[PDB]
Amino acid sequence: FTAEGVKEIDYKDLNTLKAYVSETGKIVPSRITGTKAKYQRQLATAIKRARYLALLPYTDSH
Amino acid sequence: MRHYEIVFLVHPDQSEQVGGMVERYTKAIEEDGGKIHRLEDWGRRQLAYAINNVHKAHYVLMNVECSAKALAELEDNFRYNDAVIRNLVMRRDEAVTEQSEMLKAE
Amino acid sequence: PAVKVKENEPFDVALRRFKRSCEKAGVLAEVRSREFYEKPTAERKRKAAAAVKRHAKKVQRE
Amino acid sequence: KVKKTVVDGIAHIHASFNNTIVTITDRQGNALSWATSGGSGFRGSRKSTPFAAQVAAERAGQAALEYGLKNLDVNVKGPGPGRESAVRALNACGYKIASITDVTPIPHNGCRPPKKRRV
RNA sequence: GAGUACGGUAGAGGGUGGUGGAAUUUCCUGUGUAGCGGUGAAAUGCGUAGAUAUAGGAAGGAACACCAGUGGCGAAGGCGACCACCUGGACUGAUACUGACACUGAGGUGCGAAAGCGUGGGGAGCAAACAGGAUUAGAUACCCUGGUAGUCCACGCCGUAAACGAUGUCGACUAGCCGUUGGGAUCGAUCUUAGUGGCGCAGCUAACGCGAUAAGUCGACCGCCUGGGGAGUACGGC
Ligand SMILES: [Mg+2]
Ligand SMILES: [Mg+2]
Ligand SMILES: [Mg+2]
Ligand SMILES: [Mg+2]
Ligand SMILES: [Mg+2]
Ligand SMILES: [Mg+2]
Ligand SMILES: [Mg+2]
Ligand SMILES: [Mg+2]
Ligand SMILES: [Mg+2]
Ligand SMILES: [Mg+2]
Ligand SMILES: [Mg+2]
Ligand SMILES: [Mg+2]
Ligand SMILES: [Mg+2]
Ligand SMILES: [Mg+2]
Ligand SMILES: [Mg+2]
Ligand SMILES: [Mg+2]
Ligand SMILES: [Mg+2]
Ligand SMILES: [Mg+2]
Ligand SMILES: [Mg+2]
Ligand SMILES: [Mg+2]
Ligand SMILES: [Mg+2]
Ligand SMILES: [Mg+2]
Ligand SMILES: [Mg+2]
Ligand SMILES: [Mg+2]
Ligand SMILES: [Mg+2]
Ligand SMILES: [Mg+2]
Ligand SMILES: [Mg+2]
Ligand SMILES: [Mg+2]
Ligand SMILES: [Mg+2]
Ligand SMILES: [Mg+2]
Ligand SMILES: [Mg+2]
Ligand SMILES: [Mg+2]
Ligand SMILES: [Mg+2]
Ligand SMILES: [Mg+2]
Numbered sequence: 382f383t384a385e386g387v388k389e390i391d392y393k394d395l396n397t398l399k400a401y402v403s404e405t406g407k408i409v410p411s412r413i414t415g416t417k418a419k420y421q422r423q424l425a426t427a428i429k430r431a432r433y434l435a436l437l438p439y440t441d442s443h
Numbered sequence: 444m445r446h447y448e449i450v451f452l453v454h455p456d457q458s459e460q461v462g463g464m465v466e467r468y469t470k471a472i473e474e475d476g477g478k479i480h481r482l483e484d485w486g487r488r489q490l491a492y493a494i495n496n497v498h499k500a501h502y503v504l505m506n507v508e509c510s511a512k513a514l515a516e517l518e519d520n521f522r523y524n525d526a527v528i529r530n531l532v533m534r535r536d537e538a539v540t541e542q543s544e545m546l547k548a549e
Numbered sequence: 550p551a552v553k554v555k556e557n558e559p560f561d562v563a564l565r566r567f568k569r570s571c572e573k574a575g576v577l578a579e580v581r582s583r584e585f586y587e588k589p590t591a592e593r594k595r596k597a598a599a600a601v602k603r604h605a606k607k608v609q610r611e
Numbered sequence: 612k613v614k615k616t617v618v619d620g621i622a623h624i625h626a627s628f629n630n631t632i633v634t635i636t637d638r639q640g641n642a643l644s645w646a647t648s649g650g651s652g653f654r655g656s657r658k659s660t661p662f663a664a665q666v667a668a669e670r671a672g673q674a675a676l677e678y679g680l681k682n683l684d685v686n687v688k689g690p691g692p693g694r695e696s697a698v699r700a701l702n703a704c705g706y707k708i709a710s711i712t713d714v715t716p717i718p719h720n721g722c723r724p725p726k727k728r729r730v
Numbered sequence: 731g732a733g734u735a736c737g738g739u740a741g742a743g744g745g746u747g748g749u750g751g752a753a754u755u756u757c758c759u760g761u762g763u764a765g766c767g768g769u770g771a772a773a774u775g776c777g778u779a780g781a782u783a784u785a786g787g788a789a790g791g792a793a794c795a796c797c798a799g800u801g802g803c804g805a806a807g808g809c810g811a812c813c814a815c816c817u818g819g820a821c822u823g824a825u826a827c828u829g830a831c832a833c834u835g836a837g838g839u840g841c842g843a844a845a846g847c848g849u850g851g852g853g854a855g856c857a858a859a860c861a862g863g864a865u866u867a868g869a870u871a872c873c874c875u876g877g878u879a880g881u882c883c884a885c886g887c888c889g890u891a892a893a894c895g896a897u898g899u900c901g902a903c904u905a906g907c908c909g910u911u912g913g914g915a916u917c918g919a920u921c922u923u924a925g926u927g928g929c930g931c932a933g934c935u936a937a938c939g940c941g942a943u944a945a946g947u948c949g950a951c952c953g954c955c956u957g958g959g960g961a962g963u964a965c966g967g968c
Contacts, residue, residue: 640785641761722855
């Protein structure tokens with residue numbers, strides 16, 4: 382994040398985005414991951430955009 | 444001048460004309476003076492949920508330097524095509540050309 | 550939400566795992582939070598009370 | 612005088628606050644046997660208790676054992692009490708609990724719920 | 731002081747279209763049979779003219795879980811699904827430019843929650859009025875089962891709210907400590923701006939309390955008050 386790896390994120394690094402979702406398919410709060418607010422907003426919009434393209438499930442059940 | 448990064452996924456049952464479709468879609472960018480910056484196909488994917496009673500689709504992305512007329516024609520063809528099933532357009536204020544993820548595995 | 554039974558596990562780990570997964574998903578909380586309409590004034594009031602209590606608890610450690 | 616066999620079915624628990632309903636079907640969702648806490652003979656506040664859920668679930672399982680049914684996928688829906696009591700009641704009947712899932716519906720925004728009670 | 735030109739930053743700021751997934755309801759069809767629903771306990775109501783549950787399909791309307799935060803933006807009212815198009819403002823850094831071009835503002839001019847009104851659409855859920863069942867001495871209520879306007883959309887009107895920080899706008903000064911949202915510098919640390927919160931020295935206050943986001947020390951302009959009722963009512967004008 383901060384030092385070298387990826388100054389910005391997008392709906393392409395599905396590993397990193399998958400690392401920030403609960404097992405039921407919900408975005409994890411920033412108080413748990415300890416991330417910054419701006420990156421949290423970028424993360425949420427990336428997850429929703431990726432979710433529209435059926436890359437990620439809306440719900441774990443479906 | 445007005446960038447557009449389009450992601451389009453097409454029906455699996457007729458997922459062989461994906462070539463024909465992509466090289467008939469990119470016929471308008473060059474005549475308008477626009478440069479193609481990326482055209483990546485990684486089709487035969489599994490959907491996270493059933494879209495119109497199917498579970499698989501053929502994915503593709505392309506970056507386009509177009510104007511209003513060419514873009515609007517693109518979404519017209521998309522909307523009236525029976526294989527569009529899904530579509531997204533993602534304007535950016537810069538040009539990207541260096542892959543998306545390829546197959547980092549073997 | 551869903552639980553896996555494997556390695557002929559006894560019928561005690563199964564229920565405990567199911568309960569743990571359910572509380573992780575917070576199904577009961579969400580279904581309880583929708584049995585009646587809860588107007589936006591009460592929304593803001595409850596959230597303000599939660600904020601003041603949370604800050605008081607955070608300060609009380611010092 | 613009609614007979615048919617079935618193996619590896621699915622059992623549904625509908626556990627609302629007032630009452631819990633247990634039913635058994637195949638993978639195709641065709642009813643085989645069902646039992647209700649109201650039918651078990653409680654008729655009141657007792658109908659909400661987990662013990663009534665246990666009784667109803669075991670009664671329905673014992674009624675459905677006539678078809679064989681050596682395997683069950685049990686799925687639960689509803690926040691009422693007896694959410695897990697019926698599971699143990701079914702396990703007492705002598706089935707194989709293949710999997711347990713919840714199918715509690717959660718609207719994202721949806722319709723608006725009714726007015727708040729003033730009691 | 732005020733403003734202009736040039737790169738960037740963040741944002742539920744506004745408007746016009748399109749598209750998503752969860753869920754409710756209704757209709758059709760399969761299996762299946764005696765209950766479902768609701769309550770403090772009940773009953774009305776729905777069921778063998780086959781209900782509830784369960785599986786598949788279809789129609790339609792509305793709101794946009796999780797992110798979500800003493801979080802952000804807006805003059806206020808207010809603004810959360812995603813994308814495209816049109817568009818306002820604010821923060822941030824250096825240089826260059828204009829050379830007082832400023833503040834306030836009686837009248838006037840606009841924007842202005844919800845409910846309401848007019849014309850035309852739409853109508854899933856909720857739900858004033860209303861019907862029935864309970865509770866009760868009575869119950870024109872609280873509780874339960876249903877349910878029409880309305881809530882939604884387009885255009886027009888209406889001008890009101892505990893429209894509240896119960897605190898007019900603008901400018902300058904006055905010990906400190908702990909957070910947090912944007913942005914900068916210097917070497918995780920230090921400094922500096924524009925917001926948003928918690929304490930607190932002087933000072934102020936009838937007291938509560940305020941305390942660099944003053945209710946302290948001062949200036950400029952505007953609005954308003956003069957015991958409680960009658961009464962924000964009557965008459966007149968608009
Ligand atoms: Mg109710
Ligand atoms: Mg049904
Ligand atoms: Mg269905
Ligand atoms: Mg406000
Ligand atoms: Mg209105
Ligand atoms: Mg009206
Ligand atoms: Mg109207
Ligand atoms: Mg009308
Ligand atoms: Mg209705
Ligand atoms: Mg009622
Ligand atoms: Mg009703
Ligand atoms: Mg109704
Ligand atoms: Mg009327
Ligand atoms: Mg409207
Ligand atoms: Mg307000
Ligand atoms: Mg006032
Ligand atoms: Mg007063
Ligand atoms: Mg004012
Ligand atoms: Mg002032
Ligand atoms: Mg001004
Ligand atoms: Mg000022
Ligand atoms: Mg000032
Ligand atoms: Mg203080
Ligand atoms: Mg005073
Ligand atoms: Mg005083
Ligand atoms: Mg003076
Ligand atoms: Mg003065
Ligand atoms: Mg003055
Ligand atoms: Mg007087
Ligand atoms: Mg008098
Ligand atoms: Mg008088
Ligand atoms: Mg009057
Ligand atoms: Mg008089
Ligand atoms: Mg008059």
